[PDB]
Design a protein around this ligand. Structure first.
Ligand code: CLA
Ligand code: CLA
Ligand code: CLA
Ligand code: CLA
Ligand code: CLA
Ligand code: CLA
Ligand code: CLA
Ligand code: CLA
Ligand SMILES: CC1=CCCC(C)(C)[C@H]1/C=C/C(C)=C/C=C/C(C)=C/C=C/C=C(C)/C=C/C=C(C)/C=C/C1=C(C)CCCC1(C)C
Ligand SMILES: CC1=CCCC(C)(C)[C@H]1/C=C/C(C)=C/C=C/C(C)=C/C=C/C=C(C)/C=C/C=C(C)/C=C/C1=C(C)CCCC1(C)C
Ligand SMILES: CC1=C(C/C=C(\C)CCC[C@H](C)CCC[C@H](C)CCCC(C)C)C(=O)c2ccccc2C1=O
Lengths: 34, 80, 90, 30, 139, 107, 732, 161
């Protein structure tokens, strides 16, 4: 595979950091009074 | 809150008022029917939406109608 | 809920009479019932003749017979217009 | 075959599409 | 008229069914009634309590709990002397029931009709007629 | 459990046709049917069925053959009781047929 | 307290119900607070640009992942032996046996094998290398950006269209028929003639040379002379090797019928002439309506004038024009019904008349494509009836529709609903009775007492198309007949060659098993139609709730009075018809898949004998074909079917979890949740943490939706794992 | 024959069905002595099997490739005994049952307690009705044309809509 390092970089980020960050910020947005 | 309406087919039987568990309904004076009284909904902020009033109503289609609306702590029946 | 637009020249075509108003014929509103009836028979005969002449279809069909074959369905619309005009006194 | 530089061009254009999707989503959200 | 906070509560051994933090931070309901006897009743939130002869006072979380107990006292012990209050954490006490001294199932003068619609239920407006309009469906 | 118990041991019920154990093969299928049929009563509500009965009553009124005992959809509780009875009958029946044909053939 | 910014009633709910309901109502813009008609149409326009951009990003992603990680060039060399690759696997939970088991496809990394058919589609239309797959992915990324920008642009104050634009029916119909349908069909004919057909014949044509390479040797000279038939001369020979110059002809528009003998697919020159003729017809259709120049039709005038004079339709279609124009739900219902029929035609005509080279030898791709498009068809058909119910509740005005076709439908809704009830019961009693008949009588050792009805009507239709298998001589089957003689010079030889070889799926032979399953399909259709029609026609009112329209489309019930009113809303008739849609698509895809795996093995007699009773369906289809699937892993190892073997169990779990939401209802759960609220408040070290939203049990309608979603997802995942793994494991 | 089917009397697969069905019974009979009750039971089952196969062969039924009889139901008269005539018999019985039940519900409406007549059936009157059904086609059509079968649309309760 060409640029074979890309899955091992992007899959943890897309699979863990991206949902962890959207859950954190969605939680902040849905639990704010203003 | 829930929205409770009384239509002018009410025969003034007071059954809705007695069946309401949250003292939402009461009887007021009205010349339209033979009983001289009609049901009223002055305290719908306390209505939990049980629809026991509609069950009690004997007119062919209900003179009292409950329309479930926005939920609050009172209308959700939450003791917490 | 808001005004629905229609093209300019839109008129009312709802009818409960024996025949619709001649306005339902569009550009053919002024043609006589005899002229639609003769066009109806003419288009039916010419269209049927042209259709018949190319029923075994080949890789070389005569284009005039193909185009003339479209006169058969057009004749149906012509005799409907003839009935409409005869019942509107035209 | 595809070079990694070609992959990087694709990633740039998808980044531009992400920026445009954010702007459209904010416009729809008002 | 106002709730006398000093009225003795009916004897009760406690339960988990009582009120929670929402009562001390949002609102609480209180009910008082007169008993001619020192007799056992059932709490809306649990087991059995004993109402003391004289004046009793309870605290509950929901208005429906105070009225379910009121229905019970009237049906079994024939106690029609019950007054239901709402209490806010600010100390404000709000008299609730019976709202004008007379039970709602009995007519009273000076009651104004709320929610009364001049036509029958089949004469309401179709939803399409009042779409993108503020007009109410009750005619 | 799926492969080595249910799949492997259902061989006797499903191959029982034409033998003395064909009754168990038929009851295996029939109980699968009754079990599935129960979900009609369990996932549904009374109001749909009363409104459907209204159109059926209309067709009877049209032919002047409506009954004097007015048809009703089953009560809410009875819809639950009928769903539970047919669920248990189908599930226990499916196991009854599976257990008996399997152990009669192999044991 | 501000998430549902479009709903102040939900933004003030203090429970967890606010989050769920805010997520579930987000796209229902008509009900959002302070929504005008201007803003409703403009938000729908912008979100249609956003949906188009999502579709272009999905297509570019498939092209990119195949270009990057696929084996497209190796598959192109040897398409019947190589298994196409979808994308690579990078999963840090894999064991090393799992890494080895998924390293198929001729590559050095674990990989998924594609069941979508995109390889056969891209090969047939011209793609030959990875670099033009990558070129297509960058073009779709650009188009996605263009449509995201256009969606943003048409929300800007100067570029926001008025309602007068959004309701111009005649200009939109002219442009969508002549440009969106017709001209793009003409342009696809151009692509086939200029690129796909030349590269099907060995000659590369791309943007670098397509202006200096003529599609035809004569070249646009026969077109401008009327010598059009010179473009059909010298078609591809039956010795042609697709992709190469050997056996290749020079025709571009020839009509031959039948299949290319080696690809088993329709000729590319038939497809190019199809799209040329469709393009011409649709461009002509797109000049029907009057826009700005005084020729054409008013849609309002056509609708108003079509009232039959006998009076049987009442006022006819008077007032339908305004009703359809003002109701987006009526438009959605018509669009979804039309789309549902087409995606069913796509499923039926793509297995019987395949257009892509070497597909229909990919039994997994053929099975997945049929199943996929039939499930999409069932969802679109349910949605059409759901949005017709929403139309009657919300958008229908009985006073602008006096004595219409619509009002007269509602005027005889009990005649309609009771006759659907009768035909559903009529079909059900006897189809199930014959199936149980054959079951019981085969069980007692007497299969010759079965009731086996020959499907003579469909066999006669097959013979009318030229099938010489049932000895019916009517129409095309007769050597001498006006129908047979008329088509003899054009498509009839190739069509008879295609329909009288038993090597394809064109008009497959049918028998008593096909008769019984067709009646079961008819029972399933009429019953799903019953539930949906009953929901649409009783949506406005019934005898239990004569005022049902005042409560909306989706409300839980009217309470326990009047006997009980659970599932009384029109939404609950959508809910109930979703089970019957799943059941009917199950019966359809089970029938398609069993008939095809038995034919592909060479054992059609196994379907012929076992399909007439239900134990044949249970042991010879579900039980017999489960074994490669459930052995994807076992205590002795694992193979590449291990993922479908897991999805299979996964599907059984979700489906059963749906039962919990569908059988058990709210009151039980609210009382549990109150004991959990108490326990949290009384537990030390834990009551330091407090909820912002009061935990409540799900609502009645929400629980119905969640159970429906779990049921449906389990249904899809279980069958997808089965239909893919059993066909893969068997290869036949 | 019809639809490429073969008459069951000359189908070879039908003959193999009959032979396999009899061998299966004969191998069960090979485990019993001559006069035993299981031997008489299986010999009577072999006679029944042979009789059924013989009757099917001579009836004009058509067999398939699987050797099982197939039914032709397109309306042709050479095959009316498989659907058209059983269907005529059914519709005569079903219309009888419907006509008789309808006559009893109309009788029960004119009763002192109409709903008690439906859970406690007046058996002499209901038997008077069951006997009348033999001429239901004529009675029901005369009922129809005399305006007593169909009630007009305005005496039927419908939903408000
Ligand atoms: C809808 C399109 C789509 C989908 C479903 C996938 C799916 C996948 N890609 Mg991706 N990919 C796509 C488009 C897509 N691709 C495009 C257009 C590009 C070119 C820029 C890439 C470039 C790319 C790389 C470089 C890699 C993947 C990888 C992967 C795999 C792991 C996920 C990952 O790391 O994502 C990361 C993906 C990206 C950073 C690209 C952006 C994804 C697209 C453009 C966004 C689509 C958004 C969608 C429309 C809306 C989603 C929101 C939804 C909630 C509504 C997975 C099979 C990884 C892989 O192969 O692992 C084995 C990997 O390393 N992809
Ligand atoms: C069954 C189909 C059908 C029917 C009945 C009609 C009928 C009619 N068309 Mg339409 N038309 C059709 C299909 C049809 N058209 C299609 C498919 C197209 C696309 C090519 C058109 C495009 C078309 C145009 C552009 C115009 C008509 C016009 C007319 C009217 C002319 C009558 C005439 O020639 O009198 C002699 C007539 C009412 C004319 C008219 O006046 O419309 C009101 C007109 O300007 N037609
Ligand atoms: C020629 C001019 C033209 C063209 C090309 C379009 C094109 C389009 N318009 Mg329209 N529009 C026009 C003029 C035009 N418009 C005018 C003049 C007006 C004002 C009166 C409008 C007003 C308008 C509105 C209000 C909206 C559109 C929308 C759309 C888009 C529809 C959604 C879509 O992609 O469907 C694509 C459809 C097709 C490609 C054809 C349908 C195909 C059928 C179903 C079957 C095909 C089968 C075939 C085998 C496919 C094979 C696939 C392959 C994998 C094998 C589409 C891009 C909508 C949209 O999405 O906005 C962004 C929308 O909301 N338009
Ligand atoms: C195996 C499961 C199953 C079965 C058999 C049925 C059967 C039926 N459903 Mg139900 N349904 C089911 C599952 C099932 N459903 C599920 C899971 C759902 C989702 C909640 C629904 C939702 C649903 C709705 C919403 C509707 C139906 C309708 C129907 C009818 C459609 C078929 C028809 O009209 O005639 C087929 C008739 C039969 C199959 C009856 C069988 C004949 C019986 C078995 C006779 C046997 C008598 C026997 C002697 C009894 C022995 C009793 C013993 C104690 C002595 C039929 C009654 C529709 C309806 O009623 O329209 C008329 C309708 O509106 N169903
Ligand atoms: C309402 C009932 C109903 C429905 C929905 C269908 C639906 C279907 N049938 Mg079935 N069929 C039915 C009744 C029905 N059939 C009956 C009663 C018979 C006679 C046994 C057949 C015989 C039959 C054959 C032989 C074939 C089909 C096929 C099909 C399919 C294609 C359409 C077709 O041929 O229609 C057929 C439609 C009719 C025959 C119209 C029936 C309408 C009346 C009202 C039903 C009642 C008739 C009544 C019982 C008989 C009158 C009395 C008579 C005995 C004197 C479709 C699934 C074909 C197919 O694709 O199979 C794979 C096929 O080859 N059907
Ligand atoms: C397969 C179907 C299924 C499943 C999984 C459940 C699951 C459950 N039921 Mg239900 N139920 C079902 C069918 C099912 N039920 C049916 C058909 C009925 C009809 C009568 C009911 C009626 C019912 C009642 C009346 C009661 C339950 C109760 C329970 C709970 C038991 C406590 C427990 O095991 O917690 C552990 C949870 C599980 C075992 C679920 C599976 C989780 C596994 C371990 C995997 C987890 C994966 C992980 C979270 C993934 C994270 C990442 C991901 C988010 C991306 C649990 C939530 C009881 C309850 O709530 O009291 C506690 C209870 O009172 N159920
Ligand atoms: C505890 C036992 C159990 C349970 C509860 C389930 C539950 C399920 N299985 Mg599983 N399964 C099990 C054991 C079980 N399975 C075992 C032991 C095996 C063997 C390893 C399988 C093999 C298996 C396969 C291979 C399939 C399932 C499917 C299903 C689903 C059926 C969904 C539905 O609503 O049916 C709807 C039911 C139908 C649509 C048809 C029912 C099946 C009949 C027998 C065949 C069709 C007959 C004919 C076409 C119609 C006759 C018409 C009528 C008029 C007579 C569901 C998730 C299927 C699925 O996902 O469905 C989409 C599927 O493909 N399972
Ligand atoms: C003899 C009385 C009688 C008569 C004349 C009818 C007549 C009719 N019914 Mg009704 N029906 C009846 C009893 C009757 N029904 C009973 C008892 C039930 C409850 C099971 C139903 C349930 C029912 C449904 C659910 C539907 C009809 C439908 C229909 C119509 C079409 C025929 C049909 O589908 O039959 C179908 C018949 C059944 C499904 C059940 C019949 C069960 C038995 C055989 C009949 C009762 C016999 C009775 C005990 C007579 C005793 C007489 C004695 C005292 C002298 C027609 C209006 C359909 C319709 O509206 O289409 C327009 C429809 O959807 N009926
Ligand atoms: C559902 C949804 C919600 C709201 C409404 C909606 C908007 C219509 C809809 C749409 C959703 C849509 C359409 C969502 C679309 C989402 C998309 C297209 C996301 C694309 C992401 C691409 C990324 C992060 C790549 C970044 C590459 C980089 C940083 C590489 C950089 C570089 C490399 C290494 C090499 C070059 C140099 C540098 C620059 C250094
Ligand atoms: C619920 C609801 C409420 C009100 C609003 C609403 C949205 C409109 C509505 C929804 C309604 C819905 C969802 C309606 C759905 C309607 C559907 C799915 C209709 C299907 C129509 C198919 C037809 C007419 C096929 C005709 C084929 C023919 C004639 C072939 C002929 C032939 C040819 C040419 C070739 C072969 C030979 C033969 C056979 C001779
Ligand atoms: C089908 C169905 C009905 C209608 C079901 C009816 C009217 C039952 C039909 C019984 C008929 C009248 C007789 C047939 C009885 C069987 C032949 C055998 C019954 C055996 C015992 C009754 C003795 C409901 O009322 C209902 C209510 C609440 C939730 C779900 C449902 C539900 O699913």
């Amino acid at each position: 595979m060409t640029a074979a390092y890309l899955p091992s970089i992007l899959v943890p980020i897309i699979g863990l950091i991206f949902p962890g960050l959207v859950m954190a910020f969605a939680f902040i947005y849905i639990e704010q009074d203003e | 809150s829930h929205s409770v309406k009384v239509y002018d087919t009410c025969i003034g039987c007071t059954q809705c008022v007695r069946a309401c568990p949250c003292d939402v309904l009461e009887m007021v004076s009205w010349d339209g029917c033979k009983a001289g009284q009609i049901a009223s909904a002055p305290r719908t902020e306390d209505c939990i939406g049980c629809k026991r009033c509609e069950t009690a109503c004997p007119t062919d289609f209900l003179s009292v109608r409950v329309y479930l609306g926005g939920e609050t702590t009172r209308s959700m029946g939450l003791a917490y | 809920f808001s005004p629905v637009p229609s093209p300019e020249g839109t008129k009312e075509t709802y009818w409960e009479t024996k025949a619709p108003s001649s306005d339902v014929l569009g550009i053919g509103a002024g043609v006589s019932s005899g002229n639609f009836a003769a066009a109806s028979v003419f288009a039916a005969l010419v269209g049927g003749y042209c259709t018949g002449q190319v029923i075994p279809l080949t890789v070389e069909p005569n284009p005039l017979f193909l185009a003339g074959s479209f006169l058969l369905p057009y004749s149906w619309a012509l005799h409907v217009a003839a009935w409409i005009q005869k019942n509107n006194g035209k | 075959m595809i070079s990694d530089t070609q992959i990087f061009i694709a990633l740039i254009l998808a980044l531009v599409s992400l920026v445009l999707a954010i702007r459209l989503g904010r416009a729809l959200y008002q | 008229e106002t709730l006398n906070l000093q009225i003795p509560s009916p004897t009760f051994e406690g339960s988990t069914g009582g009120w929670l933090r929402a009562a001390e931070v949002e609102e609480k309901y209180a009910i008082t009634w007169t008993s001619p006897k020192e007799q056992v009743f059932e709490m809306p939130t649990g087991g059995a309590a004993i109402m003391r002869q004289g004046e009793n006072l309870l605290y509950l979380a929901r208005k429906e709990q105070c009225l379910a107990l009121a229905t019970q006292v009237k049906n079994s012990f024939k106690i029609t002397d019950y007054k239901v209050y709402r209490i806010f954490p600010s100390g404000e006490v709000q008299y609730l029931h019976p709202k004008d001294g007379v039970f709602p199932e009995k007519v009273n003068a000076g009651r104004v009709g709320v929610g009364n619609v001049s036509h029958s239920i089949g004469k309401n407006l179709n939803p399409a007629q009042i779409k993108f309009t503020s007009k109410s469906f009750n005619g | 459990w799926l492969r080595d118990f249910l799949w492997a041991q259902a061989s006797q019920v499903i191959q029982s046709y034409g033998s003395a154990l064909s009754a168990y093969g038929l009851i295996f299928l029939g109980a699968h049917f009754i079990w599935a049929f129960s979900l009609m009563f369990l996932f549904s509500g009374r109001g749909y069925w009363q409104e459907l009965i209204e159109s059926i009553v209309w067709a009877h009124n049209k032919l002047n053959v409506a009954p004097a005992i007015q048809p009703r959809a089953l009560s809410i509780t009875q819809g639950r009781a009928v769903g539970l009875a047919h669920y248990l009958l189908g599930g226990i029946g499916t196991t009854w047929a599976f257990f008996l044909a399997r152990i009669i053939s192999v044991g | 307290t501000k998430f549902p910014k479009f709903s102040q009633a939900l933004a003030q709910d203090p429970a967890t119900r606010r989050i769920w309901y805010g997520l579930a109502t987000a796209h229902d813009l008509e009900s959002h607070d302070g929504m005008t008609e201007e803003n409703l149409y403009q938000k729908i326009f912008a979100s249609h640009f956003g949906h188009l951009a999502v579709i272009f990003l999905w297509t570019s992603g498939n092209l990119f992942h195949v270009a990057w990680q696929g084996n497209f060039e190796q598959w192109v060399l040897n398409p019947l032996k190589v298994k196409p690759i979808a994308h690579a696997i990078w999963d840090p939970h894999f064991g090393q046996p799992a890494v080895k088991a998924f390293t198929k496809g001729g590559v050095s990394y674990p990989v998924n094998i594609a069941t979508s058919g995109v390889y056969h589609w891209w090969y047939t239309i011209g793609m030959r290398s990875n670099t033009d797959l990558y070129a297509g992915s960058l073009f779709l990324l650009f188009l996605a950006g263009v449509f995201l920008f256009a969606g943003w642009l048409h929300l800007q104050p100067k570029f926001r269209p008025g309602l007068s634009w959004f309701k111009n029916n005649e200009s939109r119909l002219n442009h969508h028929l002549s440009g969106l349908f017709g001209f793009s069909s003409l342009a696809w004919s151009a692509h086939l003639i200029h690129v796909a057909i030349p590269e099907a014949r060995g000659q590369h044509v791309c943007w670098d040379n397509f202006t200096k390479v003529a599609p035809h040797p004569a070249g646009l000279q026969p077109f401008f002379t009327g010598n059009w038939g010179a473009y059909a001369a010298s078609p591809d020979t039956t010795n042609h090797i697709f992709g190469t110059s050997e056996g290749a002809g020079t025709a571009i528009l020839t009509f031959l019928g039948g299949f290319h003998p080696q690809t088993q697919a329709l000729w590319l020159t038939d497809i190019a002439h199809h799209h040329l003729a469709i393009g011409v017809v649709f461009i002509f259709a797109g000049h029907m309506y009057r826009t700005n120049w005084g020729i054409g039709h008013s849609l309002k005038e056509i609708l108003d004038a079509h009232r039959p004079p006998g009076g049987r339709l009442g006022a006819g279609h008077k007032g339908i024009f305004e009703t359809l124009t003002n109701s987006l739900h009526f438009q959605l219902g018509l669009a979804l019904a039309s789309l549902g029929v087409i995606t069913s035609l796509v499923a039926q005509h793509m297995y019987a008349l395949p257009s892509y080279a070497f597909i229909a030898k990919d039994y997994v791709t053929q099975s997945a494509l049929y199943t996929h498009h039939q499930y999409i068809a069932g969802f679109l058909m349910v949605g059409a009836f759901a949005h017709g119910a929403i139309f009657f509740v919300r958008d229908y005005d009985p006073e602008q529709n006096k004595n219409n076709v619509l009002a007269r439908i509602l005027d005889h809704k009990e005649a309609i609903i009771s006759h659907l009830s009768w035909v559903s019961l009529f079909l059900g009693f006897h189809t199930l009775g014959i199936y149980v008949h054959n079951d019981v009588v085969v069980a007692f050792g007497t299969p010759e007492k079965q009731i086996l009805v020959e499907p003579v009507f469909a066999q006669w239709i097959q013979a009318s198309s030229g099938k010489a298998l049932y000895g019916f001589d009517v129409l095309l089957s007769s050597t001498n007949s006006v129908a047979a003689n008329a088509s003899s010079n054009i498509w009839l030889p190739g069509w008879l060659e295609a329909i009288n070889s038993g090597k394809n799926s064109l008009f497959l032979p049918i028998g008593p098993g096909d008769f019984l399953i067709h009646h079961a399909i008819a029972l399933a259709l009429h019953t799903t139609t019953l539930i949906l029609v009953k929901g649409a026609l009783d949506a406005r009112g019934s005898k239990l709730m004569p005022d049902k329209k005042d409560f909306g489309y989706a409300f839980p019930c009217d309470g326990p009075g009047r006997g009980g009113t659970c599932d009384i809303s029109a939404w609950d008739a959508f809910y109930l018809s979703m089970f019957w849609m799943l059941n009917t698509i199950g019966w359809v895809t089970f029938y398609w898949h069993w008939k095809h795996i038995t034919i592909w093995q060479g054992n059609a007699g196994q379907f012929n004998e076992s399909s007439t009773y239900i134990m044949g369906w249970l042991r010879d289809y579900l039980w017999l074909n489960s074994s490669p699937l459930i052995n994807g892993y076992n205590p002795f190892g694992m193979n590449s079917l291990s993922v479908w073997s897991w999805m299979f169990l996964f599907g059984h779990l979700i489906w059963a979890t749906g039962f919990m939401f569908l059988i058990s209802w709210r009151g039980y759960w609210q009382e549990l949740i109150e004991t959990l609220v108490w326990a949290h408040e009384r537990t030390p070290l834990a009551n330091l943490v407090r909820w912002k939203d009061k935990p409540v049990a799900l609502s009645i309608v929400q629980a119905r939706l969640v159970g429906l979603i779990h049921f449906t997802a389990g249904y899809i995942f279980t069958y997808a794992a089965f239909v893919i793994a059993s066909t893969t494991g068997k290869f036949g | 024959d019809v639809a490429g089917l073969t008459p069951c009397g000359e189908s070879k697969e039908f003959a193999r069905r009959l032979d396999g069905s009899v061998k299966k019974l004969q191998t069960r009979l090979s485990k019993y002595e001559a006069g035993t009750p299981p031997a008489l039971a299986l010999q009577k089952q072999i006679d029944k099997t042979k009789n059924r196969f013989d009757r099917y062969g001579k009836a004009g039924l058509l067999c398939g490739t699987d050797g099982l009889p197939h039914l032709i139901t397109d309306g042709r008269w050479t095959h009316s005994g498989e659907f058209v005539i059983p269907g005529l018999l059914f519709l005569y019985v079903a219309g009888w049952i419907g006509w008789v039940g309808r006559s009893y519900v109309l009788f029960a409406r004119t009763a002192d307690k109409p709903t008690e007549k439906e859970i406690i059936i007046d058996v002499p009157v209901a038997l008077s009705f069951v006997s009348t059904g033999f001429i239901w086609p004529f009675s029901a059509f005369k009922e129809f044309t005399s305006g007593n079968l169909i009630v007009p649309a305005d005496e039927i309760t419908v939903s408000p809509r």
